[PDB]
Amino acid sequence: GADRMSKWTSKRGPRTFTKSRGAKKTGIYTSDRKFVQIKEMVPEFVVPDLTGFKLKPYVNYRAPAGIDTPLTAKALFQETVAPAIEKDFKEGTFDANNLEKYGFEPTQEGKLFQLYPKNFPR
């Protein structure tokens, strides 16, 4: 006679049964049943200063939209790194070892914002 089709949540079951609704944990439970919040585990919203901002939620109809071109890795490379290498190649001051000079990162370890695996949320 139990309803099998309804979702299993903490409102149901005895007192002992509990579970989260998806809220991210922000602290630790120490011995003796004491909660110790950790400030670093609490997200902090980085909010910019909007003074002098010239952009509003809606855009004018008169303004014409452009052609959609999903950005690709090749396109970014040509814009940023290709010109430096091209000029350097003419000057001859280019070597395989110093690709980092143009911005190459050998490993993501040591970066605050690791590209992969991502260590930063949206």
């Binding site: 809606y58 004018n60 303004a63 914002f113």
Partner: protein, 201 residues
């Protein structure tokens, strides 16, 4: 859904929810499939009625329900009905247009009033244009007001609306830095700690 009939009312209106309840199981309409390239009827194009009550009368397309291969002409194939009927008052009698299938109408030569058949063909610039099968000629796409009703040219800038020049402004600088790294540098946040090793699995 398998059982959904497209009618004359714009989908999602009160009329279309009333006509098509979730339990509707009306007999499907069989529609000759027409390719997107094949279709040559567009809103605003003057057409002539091949057969029907108003056969031989030219009209202007004002609506195209491609799901039913329908073209609606203003003031033609028009029957009568009462609008705004209330318990107190009968309402106002109006003449309501009825949908016409594509094969019952034909497009009109831009220069001369005749039902000239057309074929799709490219141009020097490469833009696709309709060309008459006989007396080969370019019939331009007819400019028509947008369904939303907003008029671009007369639109006046207001609060919460960006200026045209401001939107056109481009300031993106290609650089190998994420948004998470550009904001901190611009906003001057400094963090020297680094996350400990994590065993992903």
């Amino acid at each position: 859904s398998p059982f959904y009939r497209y009618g004359m009312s714009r989908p999602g209106s009160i009329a279309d929810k009333r006509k098509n309840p979730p339990w509707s199981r009306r007999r499907p309409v069989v529609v000759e499939p027409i390719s997107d390239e094949d279709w040559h009827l567009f809103c605003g194009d003057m057409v002539e009625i091949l057969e029907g009550k108003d056969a031989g009368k030219q009209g202007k397309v004002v609506q195209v329900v491609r799901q039913r291969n329908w073209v609606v002409l203003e003031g033609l194939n028009t029957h009568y009905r009462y609008i705004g009927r209330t318990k107190d008052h009968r309402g106002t009698m109006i003449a309501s247009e009825a949908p016409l299938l594509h094969h019952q109408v034909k497009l009109v030569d831009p220069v001369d009033r005749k039902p000239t058949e057309i074929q799709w063909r490219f141009t020097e610039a490469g833009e696709r244009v309709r060309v008459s099968t006989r007396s080969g000629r370019i019939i331009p796409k007819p400019e028509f007001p947008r369904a939303d009703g907003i008029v671009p040219e007369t639109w006046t800038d207001g609060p919460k609306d960006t200026s045209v020049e401001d939107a056109l402004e481009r300031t993106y600088v290609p650089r190998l830095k994420t948004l998470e790294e550009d904001v901190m540098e611009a906003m001057g946040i400094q963090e020297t700690r680094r996350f400990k090793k994590v065993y992903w699995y």
